[PDB]
Design a protein around this ligand. Structure first.
Ligand code: PNR
Lengths: 171, 171
């Protein structure tokens, strides 16, 4: 491993994640990033957000039968990025059309009547810049709201409005 | 505005920092990075750590009469980096010898008998990369611990041994 790391990401083990059983890799570089919200409870401390990351992963693995938390990454209102399937593994966030050609990041919480804090927003934007730097993402990658590629309300009305202001957002 | 980002650094305004009156500029790319601990209380949440940066700046400004908090950046156990004097303004952390030829980053707390969490350490190197990425830091920069340049116990026994294993650490 030649390691020149980017950003700060709370690795799987730190948030006590069940080992992954996922195997299908994504093709680098990836062109799309889909932004969703978990629709679950929010957290603003590394302690409560490690917890929530475990909770979301348990729901997906235990109730849905997936190989791993469905998201490649999760964003905490604590301002940290939590590692999901990562940069090289296909997620289960955006359907069978989009899961194979995109990176899915999800903000932990419901943003229909609520906006996430600046640090979460910064954590997300930063991860993406890091994805481009690492070669995992296309320099001209595109960001989509979950609701742009599926019939959901995800990533929440408030959060959707915000990501539409991002330079890489393409409806 | 002012920001399209970087290292997920909490900006001055977000931690409600008094405005700075400092004017001496550092000439990049900067050669050294000095690691210190505040020797103040620690905090592990965005709220408590925003308050703790305010508390440190308050002391430096109102009581020591400094133009702004002396550190270029502060590191909270919440895993975040707090904007201090920044990449361009000379700091007041390591004396007249080192202040003009280095960037000073301080871990908020006393690390003599305590160890800073992995995320705090992550935010630090993540911070230092962001540095190089902007040309704020020297591609091959060197990390020195407070006690390597001044008669002090800073940055603490426990934190000092860790930074001793960093790939850029020097004595
Ligand atoms: C010779 C040893 C190998 C060293 C060469 C490879 C190192 C590449 C390391 C990449 C990881 C750190 C890069 C940080 C990138 C980053 O997020 O900075 C930004 C720079 C600019 C913006 N922006 O949009 O304004 C946002 C972010």
């Amino acid at each position: 491993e030649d390691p020149p790391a980017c950003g700060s990401i709370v690795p799987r083990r730190e948030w006590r994640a069940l080992a992954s059983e996922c195997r299908e890799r994504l093709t680098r570089p990836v062109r799309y990033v889909v932004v969703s919200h978990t629709a679950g409870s929010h957290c603003d401390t590394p302690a409560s957000c490690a917890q929530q990351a475990q909770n979301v992963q348990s729901y997906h693995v235990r109730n849905l039968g997936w190989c791993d938390v469905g998201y490649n990454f999760l964003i905490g209102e604590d301002g940290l990025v939590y590692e999901g399937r990562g940069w090289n593994i296909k997620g289960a966030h955006a359907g069978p059309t989009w899961n194979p050609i995109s990176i899915g990041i999800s903000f932990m919480g419901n943003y229909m009547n609520r906006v996430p804090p600046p640090r979460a927003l910064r954590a997300a934007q930063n991860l993406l810049a890091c994805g481009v730097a690492l070669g995992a993402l296309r320099s001209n990658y595109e960001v989509k709201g979950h609701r742009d590629v599926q019939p959901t309300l995800s990533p929440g009305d408030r959060l959707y409005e915000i990501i539409q202001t991002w330079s890489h957002y393409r409806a």
